[PDB]
Design a protein around this ligand. Structure first.
Ligand SMILES: Nc1nc2c(ncn2[C@@H]2O[C@H](COP(=O)(O)OP(=O)(O)O)[C@@H](O)[C@H]2O)c(=O)[nH]1
Ligand SMILES: OC[C@H]1O[C@H](O)[C@H](O)[C@@H](O)[C@@H]1O
Ligand SMILES: OC[C@H]1O[C@H](O)[C@H](O)[C@@H](O)[C@@H]1O
Ligand SMILES: [Mg+2]
Lengths: 163, 91
């Protein structure tokens, strides 16, 4: 049939590595605001429309309303930023509110797993993801650990929601 | 896209109710800090869901000037709105 598209939106606090994860997925290196990539996930060829959290100076009401209708959401925090983790519930609540749905495909992502200065324990994030009924992926945009896994798990979650 | 019309709609000598109008941009949460004007005592900080437009601050002292500041964190855009602040004297 037609090539299936997946609208993914990457949200999270500032500096947690959203753009870094997205650029690692698209261009496979570390160091614009919207990208599209053909991927093969579980055999199916899909078109990923990745919407990164752009800067304020790029604000447009059209893009805001368009991201309000995203199919999947990556909730990114950094393991060295306690406030980025403690504010994750705000992101979940407001995304569910703007989507007007109880079942919204989401994946919790703990980036910067390569760092030694951890302040958020893996067990805490696992407990939060379990209480939400969503997967939790530890990623590192620097070492590319778990990047493809996070985005592919989000695509899978969208596939289960669609059926 | 910045919140507007920050004001106190009710007060006791130990508590305030503050309110604002939300911007058109989707807000994930509002960051609120309050403390004695002039910095005699340290500030305190908390967050309020982006679906709310009010906040209740408790435990204040009578006859004291307080400064309340509000930031709005954007859901789909980096950073915060420019902070908005008011001064209020309890008694
Ligand atoms: N050590 C480490 N640093 C990272 C990682 N991801 C991003 N960074 C760094 O964190 C800083 C901000 O990352 P950025 O992609 O702008 O995060 P964003 O603001 O949420 O999009 C940059 O200087 C990156 O080099 C990671 O996985 N590990
Ligand atoms: O609870 C506030 C916390 O803010 C920051 O995470 C500090 O680094 C930490 O030491 C402190 O406990
Ligand atoms: O005093 C202001 C208080 O407002 C709300 O009750 C918050 O739950 C609390 O965190 C904050 O300190
Ligand atoms: Mg960024």
């Amino acid at each position: 049939g037609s090539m299936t598209e997946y609208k993914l939106v990457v949200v999270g606090a500032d500096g947690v590595g959203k753009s870094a994860l997205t650029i690692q997925l698209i261009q496979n290196h570390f160091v614009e605001d919207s990208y599209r990539k053909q991927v093969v996930i579980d055999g199916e060829t899909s078109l990923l429309d990745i919407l990164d959290t752009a800067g304020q100076e790029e604000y447009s009401a059209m893009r805001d309303q368009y991201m309000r209708t995203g199919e999947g959401f990556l909730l990114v925090f950094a393991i060295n930023n306690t406030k980025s983790f403690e504010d994750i519930h705000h992101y979940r609540e407001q995304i569910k509110r703007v989507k007007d749905s109880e079942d919204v495909p989401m994946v919790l992502v703990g980036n910067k797993s390569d760092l030694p200065s951890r302040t958020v324990d893996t067990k805490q994030a696992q407990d939060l993801a379990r209480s939400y009924g969503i997967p939790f992926i530890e990623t590192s945009a620097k070492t590319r650990q778990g990047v493809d896994d996070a985005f592919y798990t989000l695509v899978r979650e969208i596939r289960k929601h669609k059926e | 896209s910045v919140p507007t019309k920050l004001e106190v709609v009710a007060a006791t000598p130990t508590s305030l109710l503050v309110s604002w109008d939300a911007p058109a941009v989707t807000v994930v949460f509002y960051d609120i800090t309050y403390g004695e004007t002039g910095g005699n005592s340290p500030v305190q900080e908390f967050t309020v869901p982006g679906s709310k437009s009010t906040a209740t601050i408790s435990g204040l002292s009578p006859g004291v000037d307080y400064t309340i500041t509000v930031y709005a964190k954007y859901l789909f855009w980096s950073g915060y709105s420019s902070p908005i602040s008011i001064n209020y004297r309890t008694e």
